Design a protein around this ligand. Structure first.
Ligand SMILES: CCCCCCCCCCCCCCCCCC(=O)OC[C@H](CO[C@@H]1O[C@H](CO[C@H]2O[C@H](CO)[C@H](O)[C@H](O)[C@H]2O)[C@H](O)[C@H](O)[C@H]1O)OC(=O)CCCCCCCCCCCCCCCCC
Ligand code: CLA
Ligand code: CLA
Ligand code: CLA
Ligand code: CLA
Ligand code: CLA
Ligand code: CLA
Ligand SMILES: CCCCCCCCCCCCCCCCCC(=O)OC[C@H](CO[C@@H]1O[C@H](CO)[C@H](O)[C@H](O)[C@H]1O)OC(=O)CCCCCCCCCCCCCCCCC
Ligand SMILES: CC(=O)O[C@H]1CC(C)(C)C(=C=C/C(C)=C/C=C/C(C)=C/C=C/C=C(C)/C=C/C=C(\C)C(=O)C[C@@]23O[C@]2(C)C[C@@H](O)CC3(C)C)[C@](C)(O)C1
Ligand SMILES: CC1=C(/C=C/C(C)=C/C=C/C(C)=C/C=C/C=C(C)/C=C/C=C(C)/C=C/C2=C(C)CCCC2(C)C)C(C)(C)CCC1
Ligand SMILES: CC1=C(/C=C/C(C)=C/C=C/C(C)=C/C=C/C=C(C)/C=C/C=C(C)/C=C/C2=C(C)CCCC2(C)C)C(C)(C)CCC1
Ligand SMILES: [Fe+2]
Lengths: 484, 31, 327, 30, 212, 34, 52, 38, 53, 64, 53
């Protein structure tokens, strides 16, 4: 008589079988984490962390392992590129294998709790019916969670007894796992300050322990117990679902806008770094500093790191992919091989021309060369349009500085047109489109996919909060009402 | 083989529609 | 009753000309400010300093072209509070930078929260199940994803819809040209739900009125089931399943299309079929209706970007503007 | 990296402690 | 005028059943030190050696566990490098920083005249001041008026609004029996901890040898 | 205290003393009256 | 408006269904094909919509 | 305890619900196959 | 470029829920609950009589 | 029902079902903590939104 | 080169008969005929009594 969408409500009044299905879900989730990491370790290429990082290869669980301090592998390599001798058990493979062993043990524990459902612990001594004292259970679980929250902040993050967390510079070129001192001032509320992570978990953990002491000692008010239906297991389901989508909306914005918990060396750059020219402005700032030192343009642009130039490329923008463009970022433009250098375009009048950069909105953007005033000087016309300001007519030459083509000058129109198209996407790079049979359409980073999954999951969990919230407050009439 | 998959999906949908029309649950009026 | 909370609870639920309740403490001021803020914007407030447009009755716009336009792109995702660091308490500068848009959107968002809470409150007061609140979660999901989630994933509040008739019409063609929103399967599920809901409204109202009893039940369910079984092949036999279905399909259409808008916030769009794009690139004679549509999307993007996004200072010469004469 | 924070000591002692407590509580009462 | 009349009005009312009726209160861990995992773990049956001989062992476990808890905290503080400011012996030019934080290092470097003052303070506490009363509970050696944190049954705690809750002896984390049990168990764990830190130091020079 | 922080504090104080407290007082008055 | 009125009417009827089934049985079994009496409480739904 | 569980309930899916589910799954496959393949 | 993973997504994304629905209906037929033209449950676990009976 | 060693241990932790504080209890304290949490959440939102610009904290990527 | 058709042969060659066996057992449980520790049929269509009542 139970419909298909109500089959799991047999567990609603069975605390022993409720632990069993929760242990089974734990076994599947821990099993997924070990399996996802093992599959990811099979397809990971750790050869070049500069132009082929984890986020270019579609690594999903690997950035979260590296964020908390797991950077070495049993194969002798590390995420930073430095060859490691002995990582111990807590390598990438050891973390993956432990989640598999934990999955099997939870699977066996789920079987025991399913079979031995009728425990005296779940029975109310006054009535003999199955009962769960939910306010007391909340105090136990809040105390246990706050102990873990405090211990994670005080020992793991601060490095007192722990590895620390991933920290980097403002441009993501020197990233490493390092102990982080807590920031107790107003700077701890800067989301990009990693010191806030340590100070939050210590402060919130302490307050949660104090709240756990209160919730383990003081019983709920009678009027609050009746209003919130605290004797019903569905009222905590509705409230936990609400807290769950509340967190998922925050972690979606934190991932999308960037924070200290989502570094660009693990998840890739954000779309707002390309919008504001974040890496571009720093690149010209370092070049202009070298020019004032007396270096020529060739050597000034040669000091620019390839990692910094790779960030200033629209193919690394997470807002450039597609919903059904599956696979890694290397499946798109290709696997990055070498920075080609910075092209400088010039007409026959010595005017320095800059290609107008492509906004993330446009799938295709017109190729336009403008001077320092802002007037359009050269063009790449649309297909067979009647050209008047074309590259051939204007006569634009291109000089490359830095990279592989350092010092080279290209003046023939087909190569100038080809590099003007590549200059529209930011820094010019050479790509291996044959290893993965890359098709040339841009894909999204792990930063883009996480936000899509968790903002959509949070939206769907808002619906579940309304449904399970209504089922709690209307439990008496949910089989129907009386005829009047 | 993509067109084969598309054709199989469309023909399967039409088969499901045929079974839903002609092999439906017969409506019986309560007494 | 006993205690000051109980007198307030009794007064709020008292039968008067309009029900108030506890949700009315949030719904009534927020909804009045959102509607009043919108009527203020379409009458007096311009969009000259944010969009380079006239959008008020004071400037000569009519009801179709007036709007409460989105903030300037330089504002980002600022809350644009009246006391915020942008307007700094200046109500005039607040109107000019588009702060009225965030006023209407934020008070409107808390308004629809209060209305859904009102649906929960009256259902508990009357004693019925809260299915109208679940059905209103469809419009909530559409409003939240389109007016909040989509600009929050984009560059700024500027790319959100502006509260106006013709401004919404621009937003339709903007998402078609820039995201190929019609080719998204989530919008397709939304169209099926919304057109199916209009079908269900028309077919149920016609059937009930045409199977009426000449005067318990007012219409013949047996006759209606017999009619549609022989006309269409299948028919409803359960009246309760028929009415859950009338709830389900338009609400599921709202929820499915909202999931695609979230993807469109991060530009995770269904823009292209890659194999069809690659084959047309190597073979210029190949052409389908999807490839013709991507050509029209390029025409939308390049011809509107100069005026739709005036902050970017796009200067597009006639050579780079796509045309049908150059194929 | 191996040998840091006690090496394999704490995971071995911790796993042995969990296994011993489960075996201690496995028997029936009275 | 007695200044304690506001306490009764600020006192929270007794907890009841949700229906409205009075709550029904509705096991083998009666003695302090008898805890859920092992219960009464008495392999040598010291409880069967006599009530006088068992009363001796309760005070003996309490005293041994109390010094071991202080001893463990002392080594963990000094081996970490935490020191008092100034000099330990201005006559011997012994700064606090010069003395090793290790157990054997601190035991030898501290002067014997300094060690005598520690011992004599313990002797003074053991023989006159903190003497065990046979009528009093085991381990209750602090006399009245020596400003000790006590948790009697029904003692008052205070909430955010100023309301007062009375804490029974069986309350979690706040009752007397919880704190009495936690003193005994932390004393038992530090008893094994301090001898383990001694032998790990004897073998490697590191009291916490795997760590560090 | 920056001007934006002072503006936020003023906004919180203004919300409490113009919206919350007057509406609550009006509710208490009309509930005890009726 | 058709989608609005369809969802509105469906939610109003689904809200005021008269109890005829068990604790977690599907409520659609509470309606019998060919029955004469009303399957939902019309006055309760009308009162809800009037107060809404 | 391994007692007979009293919360065990039979599960029901009538032919109409089966047809609705089959139609939903087939139509969803028809809609999303083009996007998965490209 | 036949996307190998896309073929499994279409096949398994169709086969597995179709299998689940077919398995649910067949055991419903065995229990006599695979019709909506039957009375509500007489007792817990006891389906009501069909309208034709 | 089955009695286990762990079940007897955890028995007092699930023995207070239905026990409530009479009346409004500590709801007034809870409302204050909820109001303080609401103000705190608005603060960190407006800091991230740059609607509150603090003294020398800058919402931008930091070094080290 | 991953043989595309070979993956379907392994997957569908395993999934389809496993599905058929699982569906047959589940409807057998609904009829009370999924145990061999029961008596033979007392009548056509009526399964025999189980060994433990
Ligand atoms: C359902 C029922 C609920 C119905 C809604 C009820 C009403 C709720 C009202 C709340 C709405 C909150 C809007 C806050 C505005 C926002 O977010 O504002 C955004 C700001 C981030 O600011 C943006 O940050 C970007 C990233 O900048 C960073 O990076 C730049 C690099 O170039 C610079 O370095 C810059 O200094 C540095 O800050 C750019 O700077 C933008 O210009 C700037 O606007 O975050 C912040 O305020 C805080 C963000 C923390 C996450 C909060 C989660 C809420 C948002 C979820 C949706 C985000 C998901 C996005 C995917 C879709
Ligand atoms: C020394 C004290 C201290 C410090 C320095 C911090 C520091 C931090 N806290 Mg912690 N905190 C503390 C003590 C502290 N905390 C205490 C005692 C508690 C109570 C237990 C908390 C509870 C807490 C919470 C609940 C949160 C933090 C967060 C943060 C971070 C703020 C920066 C950020 O990224 O927010 C970005 C977050 C923003 C949230 C804005 C408010 C929600 C807006 C959206 C609402 C809703 C989901 C709308 C839907 C979206 C719509 C579009 C659909 C930072 C790590 C936040 C993070 O993490 C966060 O959410 N803290
Ligand atoms: C929160 C969920 C989540 C997120 C954000 C990611 C993130 C990612 N995954 Mg993982 N994964 C997950 C859960 C997730 N994964 C689960 C539950 C499984 C099943 C075990 C996998 C198994 C998996 C494999 C086997 C692979 C990925 C791959 C990827 C990357 C490309 C994904 C893509 O483009 O598909 C496009 C996705 C869709 C079109 C989804 C359609 C959803 C609806 C129907 C439409 C919207 C991306 C970084 C790739 C990777 O590992 O390296 C590149 C890849 O090969 N994932
Ligand atoms: C923590 C999350 C959580 C939990 C524990 C529950 C628990 C429950 N739900 Mg709620 N719910 C949730 C979140 C949750 N729900 C969300 C996010 C939504 C909105 C989408 C809902 C909307 C909802 C409705 C509308 C209903 C329930 C029902 C139920 C009950 C029976 C469920 C059942 O039998 O499914 C059986 C499910 C199947 C047989 C197959 C489902 C296949 C799905 C659609 C696709 C497969 C997904 C898989 C992988 C998902 C992973 C992903 C979630 C991460 C049970 C009490 C029922 C109830 O409320 O009334 C008694 C019911 O009618 N839920
Ligand atoms: C000074 C040490 C000391 C004393 C006097 C007591 C006394 C008591 N204990 Mg403790 N106990 C101790 C240390 C002690 N305990 C330590 C370190 C632990 C943790 C491992 C425990 C764990 C414990 C539990 C779990 C329980 C007791 C119980 C008891 C009571 C009766 C059982 C008994 O007497 O066994 C004590 C046995 C002796 C004193 C034997 C003499 C010392 C032997 C020879 C030590 C063996 C060598 C040792 C490992 C050091 C090695 C050095 C090497 C060079 C030889 C009594 C109050 C029961 C109870 O709590 O009642 C209130 C009970 O259930 N004890
Ligand atoms: C069994 C207990 C015990 C013993 C025998 C010692 C022994 C010693 N301690 Mg340690 N210590 C202890 C516990 C102990 N400590 C505790 C509980 C703390 C607090 C965390 C410390 C913190 C501490 C510091 C910071 C230093 C010492 C130092 C010393 C040495 C010089 C004495 C001194 O000046 O400290 C006097 C203070 C105490 C002995 C602690 C308070 C006294 C008791 C335990 C509490 C009151 C009980 C009534 C000496 C070897 C010094 C050192 O190692 O090199 C010079 C030094 O700098 N101790
Ligand atoms: C006898 C010591 C004692 C104990 C065990 C508690 C215990 C508690 N207090 Mg009090 N409290 C005390 C004395 C105590 N209080 C004193 C002397 C003061 C004056 C500084 C306070 C001022 C105080 C405040 C202001 C609050 C607590 C709160 C709490 C609860 C959670 C914090 C932990 C907890 C039940 C919190 C609570 O009431 O809300 C849950 C809270 O807000 N306490
Ligand atoms: C609880 C104590 C856990 C603890 O800190 O163990 C300390 C161990 C230390 O674990 C050690 O780590 C080293 C790398 O840091 C090497 O991998 C060693 O092989 C590994 O044993 O950490 C854990 O077991 C992880 C704790 C997670 C909680
Ligand atoms: C006014 C006044 O006076 O009122 C007083 C009253 C009163 C009640 C006294 C008060 C109190 C409370 C107090 C004093 C509490 C004190 C607590 C204290 C000091 C308790 C330490 C435990 C240490 C343990 C368990 C160690 C075990 C460690 C073990 C088991 C080890 O094996 C150690 C180890 O190294 C080895 C051997 C090998 C290594 O590989 C691993 C590790 C490192 C693990 C007040 C309120 O404060 C004030
Ligand atoms: C028993 C045992 C064992 C073993 C174990 C194992 C080996 C495990 C495994 C495990 C595993 C191997 C698991 C896995 C899992 C997975 C999962 C769980 C998945 C899921 C998925 C999903 C859920 C998805 C979905 C989706 C899709 C498809 C699309 C999109 C959307 C989504 C995402 C939703 C050992 C020896 C150790 C020990 C002893 C015992
Ligand atoms: C924003 C703002 C605000 C608010 C304000 C408000 C609240 C306002 C209101 C406003 C309003 C509240 C207005 C209104 C208006 C109205 C109107 C404008 C109307 C019109 C009408 C008409 C036109 C009609 C027509 C018709 C129809 C439709 C149908 C039938 C026929 C006839 C003809 C009758 C404040 C102060 C807070 C401050 C900040 C800012
Ligand atoms: Fe109707």
């Amino acid at each position: 008589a139970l419909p298909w969408y109500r089959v799991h409500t047999v567990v609603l009044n069975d605390p022993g079988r409720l632990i069993a299905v929760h242990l089974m879900h734990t076994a599947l989730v821990a099993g997924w984490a070990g399996s996802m990491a093992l599959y990811e370790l099979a397809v990971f290429d750790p050869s070049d962390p500069v132009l082929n990082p984890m986020w270019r290869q579609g690594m999903f669980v690997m950035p979260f392992m590296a964020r908390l301090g797991v950077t070495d592998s049993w194969g002798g390599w590390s995420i930073t590129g430095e060859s490691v001798s002995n990582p111990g058990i807590w390598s990438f493979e050891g973390v993956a294998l432990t989640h598999i062993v934990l999955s099997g043990l939870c699977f066996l524990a789920a079987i025991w709790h399913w079979v031995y459902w009728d425990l005296e612990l779940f029975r109310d001594p006054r009535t003999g019916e199955p009962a769960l004292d939910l306010p007391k259970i909340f105090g136990i679980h809040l105390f246990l969670a706050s102990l873990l929250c405090f211990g994670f902040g005080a020992f793991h993050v601060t490095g007192a007894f722990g590895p620390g967390i991933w920290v980097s510079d403002a441009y993501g070129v020197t990233g490493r796992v390092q102990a982080v001192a807590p920031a107790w001032g107003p700077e701890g509320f800067n989301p990009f300050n990693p010191g806030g992570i340590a100070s939050h978990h210590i402060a919130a953990g302490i307050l949660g322990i104090l709240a756990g002491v209160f919730h383990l000692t003081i019983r709920p008010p009678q009027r609050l117990y009746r209003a919130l239906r605290m004797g019903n297991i569905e009222t905590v389901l509705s409230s936990s679902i609400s807290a769950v989508f509340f967190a998922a909306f925050i972690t979606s914005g934190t991932m999308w806008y960037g924070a200290a918990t989502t570094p660009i060396e693990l998840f890739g750059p954000t779309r707002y770094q390309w919008d504001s020219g974040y890496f571009q402005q720093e690149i010209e700032r370092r070049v202009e500093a070298s020019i004032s030192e007396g270096l020529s343009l060739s050597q000034a642009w040669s000091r620019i790191p390839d990692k910094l130039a790779f960030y200033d490329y629209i193919g690394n923008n997470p807002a450039k992919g597609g919903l059904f463009r599956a696979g890694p970022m290397n499946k798109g433009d290709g696997i990055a091989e070498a920075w080609l250098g910075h092209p400088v375009f010039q007409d026959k009048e010595g005017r320095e021309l800059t290609v107008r950069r492509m906004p993330a909105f446009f799938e295709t953007f017109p190729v336009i060369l403008v001077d320092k005033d802002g007037i359009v000087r050269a063009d790449i016309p649309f297909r067979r349009a009647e050209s008047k300001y074309s590259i051939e007519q204007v006569g634009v030459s291109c000089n490359f500085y830095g990279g592989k083509l350092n010092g080279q000058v290209f003046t023939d129109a087909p190569t100038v047109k080809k590099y003007a198209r590549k200059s529209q996407l930011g820094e010019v790079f050479e790509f291996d489109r044959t290893t993965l049979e890359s098709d040339g359409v841009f894909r999204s980073s792990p930063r883009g996919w996480y936000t899509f999954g968790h903002a959509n999951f949070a939206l769907l969990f808002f619906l579940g909060h309304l449904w399970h919230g209504g089922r709690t407050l209307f439990r008496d009439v949910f089989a129907g009402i009386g005829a009047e | 083989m993509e067109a084969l998959v598309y054709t199989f999906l469309l023909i399967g949908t039409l088969i499901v529609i045929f079974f839903a029309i002609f092999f439906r649950d017969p409506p019986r009026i309560v007494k | 009753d006993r205690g000051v909370f109980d007198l307030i609870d009794d007064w709020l639920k008292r039968d008067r000309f309009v029900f108030v309740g506890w949700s009315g403490l949030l719904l009534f001021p927020c909804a009045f400010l959102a509607v009043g803020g919108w009527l203020t914007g379409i009458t007096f407030v311009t969009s000259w300093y944010t969009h380079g447009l006239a959008s008020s009755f004071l400037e000569g716009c009519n009801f179709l072209t007036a709007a409460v336009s989105t903030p300037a792109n330089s504002m980002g995702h600022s809350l644009l509070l009246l006391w915020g660091p942008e307007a700094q308490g200046d109500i005039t500068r607040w109107f000019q930078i588009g702060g009225l848009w965030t006023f209407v959107a934020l008070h409107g968002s808390f308004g629809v929260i209060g209305f859904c809470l009102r649906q929960f409150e009256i259902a508990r007061l009357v004693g019925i199940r809260p299915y109208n609140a679940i059905a209103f979660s469809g419009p909530i999901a559409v409003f939240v994803t389109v007016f909040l989630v989509y600009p929050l994933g984009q560059a700024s509040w500027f790319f959100a819809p502006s509260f106006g008739v013709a401004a919404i019409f621009r937003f339709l063609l903007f998402l078609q040209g820039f995201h190929n929103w019609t080719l998204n399967p989530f919008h397709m599920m939304g169209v099926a739900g919304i057109l199916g809901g209009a079908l269900l409204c028309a077919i149920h109202g016609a059937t009930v009125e045409n199977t009426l009893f000449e005067d318990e039940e007012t219409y013949s369910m047996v006759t209606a089931n017999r009619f549609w079984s022989q006309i269409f092949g299948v028919a409803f036999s359960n009246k309760r399943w028929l009415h859950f279905f009338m709830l389900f399909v338009p609400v599921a259409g709202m929820w499915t299309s909202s999931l695609g808008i979230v993807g469109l916030a991060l530009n995770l769009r269904s823009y292209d079929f890659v194999s069809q794009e690659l084959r047309a690139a190597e073979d210029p004679e190949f052409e389908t209706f999807y490839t013709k549509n991507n050509l029209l999307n390029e025409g939308i993007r390049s011809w509107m970007a100069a005026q739709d996004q005036p902050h970017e200072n796009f200067i597009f010469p006639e050579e780079v503007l796509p045309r049908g004469n150059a194929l | 990296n191996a040998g840091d924070f006690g090496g394999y000591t704490i995971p071995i002692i911790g796993l042995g402690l969990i296994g011993a407590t489960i075996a201690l509580l496995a028997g029936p009462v009275d | 005028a007695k200044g304690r009349g506001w306490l009764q009005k600020a006192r929270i009312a007794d907890e009841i059943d949700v229906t409205g009726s009075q709550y029904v209160n509705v096991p083998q861990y009666d003695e302090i030190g008898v805890l859920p995992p092992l219960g009464r773990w008495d392999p040598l049956n010291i409880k069967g050696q006599g009530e006088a001989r068992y009363r001796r062992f309760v005070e003996m476990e309490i005293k041994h566990g109390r010094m071991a808890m202080a001893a463990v905290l002392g080594v963990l503080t000094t081996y970490s490098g935490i020191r008092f400011p100034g000099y330990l012996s201005k006559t011997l030019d012994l700064k606090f920083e010069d003395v090793p934080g290790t157990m054997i290092g601190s035991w030898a470097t501290v002067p014997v005249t300094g060690w005598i003052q520690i011992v004599l303070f313990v002797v003074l506490l053991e023989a006159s001041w903190w003497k065990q009363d046979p009528a009093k509970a085991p381990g209750d050696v602090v006399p009245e008026g020596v400003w000790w944190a006590r948790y009697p049954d029904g003692y008052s705690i205070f909430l955010g609004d100023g309301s007062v809750k009375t804490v029974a002896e069986d309350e979690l984390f706040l009752g007397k029996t919880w704190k009495l049990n936690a003193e005994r168990n932390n004393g038992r764990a530090a008893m094994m901890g301090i001898t383990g830190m001694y032998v790990h130091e004897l073998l490697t020079g590191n009291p916490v040898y795997p760590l560090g | 205290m920056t001007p934006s922080l002072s503006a936020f504090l003023s906004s919180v104080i203004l919300a409490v003393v113009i919206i919350v407290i007057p509406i609550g007082a009006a509710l208490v008055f009309v509930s005890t009256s009726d | 408006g058709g989608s609005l009125f369809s969802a509105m009417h469906g939610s109003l009827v689904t809200s005021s269904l008269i109890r005829e089934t068990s604790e977690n049985e599907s409520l659609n079994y509470g309606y019998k094909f060919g029955q004469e009496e009303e399957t939902y409480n019309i006055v309760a739904a009308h009162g809800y919509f009037g107060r809404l | 305890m391994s007692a007979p569980n009293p919360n065990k309930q039979p599960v029901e899916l009538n032919r109409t619900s089966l047809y609705w589910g089959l139609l939903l799954i087939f139509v969803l496959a028809v809609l999303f196959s083009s996007y998965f393949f490209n | 470029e036949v996307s190998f993973g896309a073929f499994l997504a279409v096949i398994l994304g169709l086969f597995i829920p179709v299998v689940f629905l077919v398995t649910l209906y067949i055991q419903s037929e065995a229990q006599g609950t695979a019709t909506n033209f039957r009375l509500p449950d007489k007792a817990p676990g006891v389906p009501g009589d069909r309208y034709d009976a | 029902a089955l009695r286990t060693r762990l079940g007897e241990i955890l028995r007092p932790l699930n023995a207070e079902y239905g026990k409530v504080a009479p009346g409004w209890g500590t709801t007034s304290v809870m409302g204050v903590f909820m109001a303080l949490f609401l103000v705190f959440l608005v603060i960190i939102l407006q800091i991230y939104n740059s609607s509150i610009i603090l003294e020398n904290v800058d919402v931008d990527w930091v070094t080290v």
